[PDB]
Enzyme design. Sequence first.
Site, PDB file in Angstrom:
ATOM      1  N   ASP A   1       0.848  -1.183   0.000  1.00 40.97           N
ATOM      2  CA  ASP A   1       0.000   0.000   0.000  1.00 40.97           C
ATOM      3  C   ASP A   1       0.886   1.236   0.000  1.00 40.97           C
ATOM      4  O   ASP A   1       1.546   1.531   1.000  1.00 40.97           O
ATOM      5  CB  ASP A   1      -0.930   0.005   1.211  1.00 40.97           C
ATOM      6  CG  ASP A   1      -1.857   1.203   1.226  1.00 40.97           C
ATOM      7  OD1 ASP A   1      -2.338   1.595   0.144  1.00 40.97           O
ATOM      8  OD2 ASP A   1      -2.107   1.751   2.319  1.00 40.97           O
TER       9      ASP A   1
ATOM     10  N   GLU B   1      31.998   9.733   1.455  1.00 41.86           N
ATOM     11  CA  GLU B   1      32.653   9.825   2.756  1.00 41.86           C
ATOM     12  C   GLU B   1      31.694  10.438   3.764  1.00 41.86           C
ATOM     13  O   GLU B   1      31.893  11.571   4.214  1.00 41.86           O
ATOM     14  CB  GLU B   1      33.931  10.655   2.651  1.00 41.86           C
ATOM     15  CG  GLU B   1      34.984  10.038   1.760  1.00 41.86           C
ATOM     16  CD  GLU B   1      36.196  10.918   1.587  1.00 41.86           C
ATOM     17  OE1 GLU B   1      36.178  12.074   2.054  1.00 41.86           O
ATOM     18  OE2 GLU B   1      37.176  10.454   0.976  1.00 41.86           O
TER      19      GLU B   1
ATOM     20  N   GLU C   1      30.008  11.607   7.027  1.00 43.32           N
ATOM     21  CA  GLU C   1      30.451  11.885   8.381  1.00 43.32           C
ATOM     22  C   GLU C   1      29.249  12.041   9.290  1.00 43.32           C
ATOM     23  O   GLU C   1      28.203  12.539   8.877  1.00 43.32           O
ATOM     24  CB  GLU C   1      31.287  13.145   8.447  1.00 43.32           C
ATOM     25  CG  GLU C   1      32.169  13.343   7.261  1.00 43.32           C
ATOM     26  CD  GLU C   1      33.042  14.552   7.405  1.00 43.32           C
ATOM     27  OE1 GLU C   1      33.083  15.114   8.513  1.00 43.32           O
ATOM     28  OE2 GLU C   1      33.685  14.943   6.412  1.00 43.32           O
TER      29      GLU C   1
ATOM     30  N   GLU D   1      37.867  12.528  14.954  1.00 43.90           N
ATOM     31  CA  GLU D   1      38.459  13.856  14.893  1.00 43.90           C
ATOM     32  C   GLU D   1      38.448  14.480  16.281  1.00 43.90           C
ATOM     33  O   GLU D   1      37.402  14.523  16.937  1.00 43.90           O
ATOM     34  CB  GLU D   1      37.690  14.723  13.902  1.00 43.90           C
ATOM     35  CG  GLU D   1      38.434  15.923  13.400  1.00 43.90           C
ATOM     36  CD  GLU D   1      37.702  16.597  12.267  1.00 43.90           C
ATOM     37  OE1 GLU D   1      36.648  16.075  11.859  1.00 43.90           O
ATOM     38  OE2 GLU D   1      38.171  17.649  11.785  1.00 43.90           O
TER      39      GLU D   1
ATOM     40  N   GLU E   1      33.917   9.440  11.004  1.00 36.96           N
ATOM     41  CA  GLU E   1      33.696   9.021   9.625  1.00 36.96           C
ATOM     42  C   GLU E   1      34.413   7.704   9.380  1.00 36.96           C
ATOM     43  O   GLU E   1      35.598   7.582   9.686  1.00 36.96           O
ATOM     44  CB  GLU E   1      34.195  10.067   8.637  1.00 36.96           C
ATOM     45  CG  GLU E   1      34.328   9.521   7.244  1.00 36.96           C
ATOM     46  CD  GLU E   1      35.321  10.284   6.416  1.00 36.96           C
ATOM     47  OE1 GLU E   1      35.698  11.401   6.819  1.00 36.96           O
ATOM     48  OE2 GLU E   1      35.745   9.755   5.372  1.00 36.96           O
TER      49      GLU E   1
ATOM     50  N   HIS F   1      31.675  13.896   0.953  1.00 36.14           N
ATOM     51  CA  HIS F   1      32.414  14.057  -0.287  1.00 36.14           C
ATOM     52  C   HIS F   1      32.251  12.817  -1.146  1.00 36.14           C
ATOM     53  O   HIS F   1      32.302  11.695  -0.646  1.00 36.14           O
ATOM     54  CB  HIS F   1      33.892  14.287   0.001  1.00 36.14           C
ATOM     55  CG  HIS F   1      34.159  15.394   0.968  1.00 36.14           C
ATOM     56  ND1 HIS F   1      35.386  15.575   1.564  1.00 36.14           N
ATOM     57  CD2 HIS F   1      33.363  16.380   1.441  1.00 36.14           C
ATOM     58  CE1 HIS F   1      35.334  16.622   2.365  1.00 36.14           C
ATOM     59  NE2 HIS F   1      34.117  17.128   2.310  1.00 36.14           N
TER      60      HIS F   1
ATOM     61  N   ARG G   1      41.864  24.105  -1.120  1.00 37.21           N
ATOM     62  CA  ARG G   1      40.791  23.407  -0.433  1.00 37.21           C
ATOM     63  C   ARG G   1      39.625  24.317  -0.078  1.00 37.21           C
ATOM     64  O   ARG G   1      38.892  24.023   0.870  1.00 37.21           O
ATOM     65  CB  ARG G   1      41.307  22.691   0.818  1.00 37.21           C
ATOM     66  CG  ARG G   1      41.813  23.540   1.961  1.00 37.21           C
ATOM     67  CD  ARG G   1      42.369  22.593   3.017  1.00 37.21           C
ATOM     68  NE  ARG G   1      42.824  23.250   4.237  1.00 37.21           N
ATOM     69  CZ  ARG G   1      44.041  23.743   4.423  1.00 37.21           C
ATOM     70  NH1 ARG G   1      44.951  23.662   3.461  1.00 37.21           N
ATOM     71  NH2 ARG G   1      44.349  24.312   5.579  1.00 37.21           N
TER      72      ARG G   1
ATOM     73  N   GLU H   1      36.626  14.501  -6.795  1.00 37.11           N
ATOM     74  CA  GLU H   1      35.877  14.553  -5.547  1.00 37.11           C
ATOM     75  C   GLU H   1      35.066  15.837  -5.519  1.00 37.11           C
ATOM     76  O   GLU H   1      35.629  16.926  -5.614  1.00 37.11           O
ATOM     77  CB  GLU H   1      36.812  14.482  -4.344  1.00 37.11           C
ATOM     78  CG  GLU H   1      36.103  14.593  -3.020  1.00 37.11           C
ATOM     79  CD  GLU H   1      37.055  14.754  -1.862  1.00 37.11           C
ATOM     80  OE1 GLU H   1      36.926  14.017  -0.866  1.00 37.11           O
ATOM     81  OE2 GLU H   1      37.938  15.622  -1.942  1.00 37.11           O
TER      82      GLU H   1
ATOM     83  N   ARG I   1      32.652  18.048  -3.055  1.00 36.95           N
ATOM     84  CA  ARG I   1      32.634  18.121  -1.608  1.00 36.95           C
ATOM     85  C   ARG I   1      31.408  18.801  -1.022  1.00 36.95           C
ATOM     86  O   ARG I   1      31.244  18.777   0.201  1.00 36.95           O
ATOM     87  CB  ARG I   1      33.895  18.835  -1.115  1.00 36.95           C
ATOM     88  CG  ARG I   1      35.175  18.214  -1.629  1.00 36.95           C
ATOM     89  CD  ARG I   1      36.293  19.216  -1.681  1.00 36.95           C
ATOM     90  NE  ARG I   1      36.897  19.406  -0.371  1.00 36.95           N
ATOM     91  CZ  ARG I   1      36.839  20.540   0.317  1.00 36.95           C
ATOM     92  NH1 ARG I   1      36.204  21.586  -0.186  1.00 36.95           N
ATOM     93  NH2 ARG I   1      37.414  20.630   1.506  1.00 36.95           N
TER      94      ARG I   1
HETATM   95 NI    NI Z   1      37.361  13.962   1.427  1.00 36.78          NI
END
Ligand code: NI
Lengths: 435, 435, 435
Positions: free
Chosen positions: C51, C130, C132, C179, C187, C236, C306, C324, C326
């Site tokens: 449903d 990646e 996190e 971290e 991560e 990322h 960056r 990549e 981000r």
């Molecule tokens: Ni990265």
Amino acid sequence: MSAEHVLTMLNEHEVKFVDLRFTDTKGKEQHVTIPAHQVNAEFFEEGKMFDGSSIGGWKGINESDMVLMPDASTAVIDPFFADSTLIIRCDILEPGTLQGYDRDPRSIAKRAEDYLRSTGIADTVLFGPEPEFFLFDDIRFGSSISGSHVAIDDAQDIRSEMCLVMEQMGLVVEAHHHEVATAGQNEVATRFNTMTKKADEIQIYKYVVHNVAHRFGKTATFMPKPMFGDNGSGMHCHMSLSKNGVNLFAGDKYAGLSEQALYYIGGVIKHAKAINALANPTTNSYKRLVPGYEAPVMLAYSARNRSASIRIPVVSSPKARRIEVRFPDPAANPYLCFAALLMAGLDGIKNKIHPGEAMDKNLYDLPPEEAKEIPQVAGSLEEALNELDLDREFLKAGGVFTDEAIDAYIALRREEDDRVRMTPHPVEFELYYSV
Amino acid sequence: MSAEHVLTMLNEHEVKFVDLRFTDTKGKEQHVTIPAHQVNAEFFEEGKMFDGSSIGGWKGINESDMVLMPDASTAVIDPFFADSTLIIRCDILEPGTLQGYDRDPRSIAKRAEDYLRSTGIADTVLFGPEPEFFLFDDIRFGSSISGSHVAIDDAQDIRSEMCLVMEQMGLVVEAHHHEVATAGQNEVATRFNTMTKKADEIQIYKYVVHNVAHRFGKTATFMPKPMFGDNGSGMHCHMSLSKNGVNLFAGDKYAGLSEQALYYIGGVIKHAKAINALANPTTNSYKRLVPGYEAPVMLAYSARNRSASIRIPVVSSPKARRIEVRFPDPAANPYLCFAALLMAGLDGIKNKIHPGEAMDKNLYDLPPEEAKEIPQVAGSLEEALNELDLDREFLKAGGVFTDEAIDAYIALRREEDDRVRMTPHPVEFELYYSV
Amino acid sequence: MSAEHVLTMLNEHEVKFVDLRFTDTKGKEQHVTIPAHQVNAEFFEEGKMFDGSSIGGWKGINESDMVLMPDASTAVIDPFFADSTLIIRCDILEPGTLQGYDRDPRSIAKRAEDYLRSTGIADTVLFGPEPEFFLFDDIRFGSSISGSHVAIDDAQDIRSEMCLVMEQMGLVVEAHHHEVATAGQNEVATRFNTMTKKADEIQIYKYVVHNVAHRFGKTATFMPKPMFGDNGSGMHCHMSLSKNGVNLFAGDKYAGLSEQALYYIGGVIKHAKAINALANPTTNSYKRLVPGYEAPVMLAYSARNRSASIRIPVVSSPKARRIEVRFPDPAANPYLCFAALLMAGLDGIKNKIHPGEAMDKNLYDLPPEEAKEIPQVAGSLEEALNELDLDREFLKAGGVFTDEAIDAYIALRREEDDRVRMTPHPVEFELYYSV
Ligand code: NI
Ligand code: NI
Ligand code: NI
Ligand code: NI
Ligand code: NI
Ligand code: NI
């Protein structure tokens, strides 16, 4: 299944007690526990003498005791009792004539099925209901002379282990639809059976749900609207009729549905308020039968529309062609509700009642000259009870329902309708205290 | 009383503010406060521009502002305001035509009296109501998404000083019936006046009761059934008609009651459910209109029986010959309730409607073939609203009630009926949680 | 992996239940649990009728039920359920045509990969994200009509045992970056797969993270900015394209990156706001996409800088040459986000869109005439949704995204954008209460 196998089960499992269970007209499940050594071969042909002071019609002020006659084919070990107990469902019989009591829901369901086979319309009826419940973490309610209050506080293990216990007790489960929108509301799907077997299975279903919720420190309720604005608990019922192993509901008309099926729907539609007296027996039950979105309140049938109360599921097999009525709620008494639905369908088949035309694309959107025209289910419990009082006739065909039984049922429902009617409610304090 | 005396009162009492008060269709009393130096002689012939976003029919989505035109004869100093304030009741007028608003209760009452004088049936109508209230020490109520609750916790100084303040505000009090059985329930008796003057006096009555109860740390409520099983609050209304200074209700028939009075009772009886839509406008109001003992629910008249809704008081004077209708409750809007009662009586007089026969010695004892036969008042707010929707006609005579005004009133009552209808109530948890 | 091995797994592990799991358009994971004895060989060629009242586009008001067709290659035993359960990811199919539903994220991802193989640009696409998350000790949040509140209260065993459970469920973990600056943020790195396999792995990743955090009495959240001033959670995504076993992203241009890769980056840059509607679907998601330090908000590519949203990792192997991006956050729906990124890249390759020039040494330092010039990602959810509404075209290539599916997605995101837009926030009480 016979009595000899029940005695063999007693010796095999080392059963200490036998719990004889029957059902009120209110639908509540009553029991008498006897020691296992009181169960002999003769016990299955005299039953057990019982004092009929149960609430409802059984509180008849003239009469003597009744007889509990067990059905040996309903024997099952209770999973929740510490001392091994064998549950047996019983019928209530009049001690002299040794016939089914007139005010017994199970006897009434058996009479309805017997009348079905007698009329020659069909050989058997298959019922599949979909009872939904609410799981809560906690709840406190009460109503004294100086006020009232209620407070409800809302896992996979509980649901899975419910399904495990239901399959212990002979039920064949096949799904579990936990719902994330309107969290708390669950429903276990089970396989179709005949009327009275399915009603017994609904009683087992409720028993398992309540007790498994107890053991996990939760509270389950089959109450049609336990909580405001969130979607209510319903019990959709799929009906099929079979004669010599083939559906009478399979045909060539709308959505592959046969002519006999169309008269069945017509009969259900015509008597739907007298039915509502039995399928929707509580005052709470009409807080979810309010016109609006996804409310099964329009008395019409459609495979596509989901505001119609009667749905016609689309199945890729002619052997599974059924009709689903969606207004019943899990607070109904399964025997009385199912017997009422069957008798309405049989009166529709007998009188060639044509339902009309499918309401495929007409929802609650309030058509200019159709919202008032379309028949609706009862708007309150008083209206349903009055319509039952006026429309007794379809229930009395074949002697299934006695006038005395209907009268006692109506009085028993009214004594609760009136208690609800005369207490002041906190929303009326919110609205009218200053006014 | 004219405007010049009002300006003289402003200068005399050193009034700082003037509070202009009017009444919703819900009956709630709205106000605008202006400084006393904004009140000049011209202020009484233009009124004050007002933004009509008040709840109810006044929330009309096309229209511009309305006009508050004060009635200088209703000026009275407010006893409860620290800064000396002069209260003036106002009518709502359409700014262009400068005529009474169609959705204004006070304008509707004035129109009803004007139609009375126009038809030539009588010259004036005398109304004496008997509004009863409950005094409580404390109360807490509420209803969230996870439950509901209410809790009510139940002297001569309060009653006496209520009577003192009521006589400050122009009311002529003449008794105070505190009741010891059903403790908490009070009622102050006041002298009869004409329709719209008596409705203004009822508004003053409620204001005084509420505020005096506030100052003593109590809570008064005019709510028809605030508490379970104990007797509810009613507002019996005595009607009389006078033409050139003599009763039209004084005669020689039953209990010294005249032929015109009998047609008045007949008209009230015939339309009593459309009336109930206005005199009994709340859902709480029908928890005290339940058949039983001392319930004013039988639509018949009797000087002796006290189960009849219409009583004929026995007075040792032909100059005081009135009829008392007992079903109205103090939650009614006095203007709309009184106008409805007057128009029902006038339609009964106009059409020579005969009430029938007095039900002198027939209480709720359920006669074998009379309990069902006798007409009853509406059983629920939905039934009363539907009967009002169907029976508009007697209200529209002489243009007193507009179809638009009736429609807005019915919609405004329905939006509260529905809120009550869709919430689950704690008594339904007591009865149906396990079921 | 076929169905026969799934039945063998059922018998081998003594599985009691099978949990069929699918994904909303919101990205939430829905499930239906069936008993293991309901799973037969035929069950893998009809699916299970469902449903479709799930939130989002699946709440289509005309339509009937859908079909859950399991993918037998996604079967894995659930580590957290007490009763042995086999998880199978399912597609939603239209019951008649038995084709992938238009509003199904998994079907859309499959269509995107099929269109990739159809266009002949490449044979397969490798995605490595990646995601996190934040681990908290406790959190309480809420928002009533009278205010709002939130309160968050911030080991190796949890991280290691997360990695263990992820490797139980078929994921290949290869690191765990706890971290210490911005404590709480974790991560787990996992190995690259194709689009839809990697999206299924992200769903498993989130499931494992949430449940393992539950069992240790913690709370994990993949919410892009759960906490003020501290760095937000991102996801990322490394993309590669392969044809016959060789990268199309390996070449000789900037940082050893091929011409096809450059057009892929150009296509991602051009449509990055329509992408942001799907990769950054929450309003919280734009509290971490604010210009500043280490914010992936500049739509340009650079191996060194960056602050650019698109990074080109330096790898000492031509067989691992990827790009990549981000800006995506873990609140995205992996199927829709990945399909959007793939289709943007394919539209860039098809139209020879050149990205421009690498922004190697230009951070957020606000160059005099470049900070305004460089394209940016969307600044709010409304802007991203509007750009998606305007830039549908690249999503519709090959019929992957239907206009109806995009419309339903946008409406479903807007009903939450508006709820965020109209509530008053405590920081606005801090700033504007006196003002
Ligand atoms: Ni990265
Ligand atoms: Ni056995
Ligand atoms: Ni159903
Ligand atoms: Ni004076
Ligand atoms: Ni009285
Ligand atoms: Ni294996």
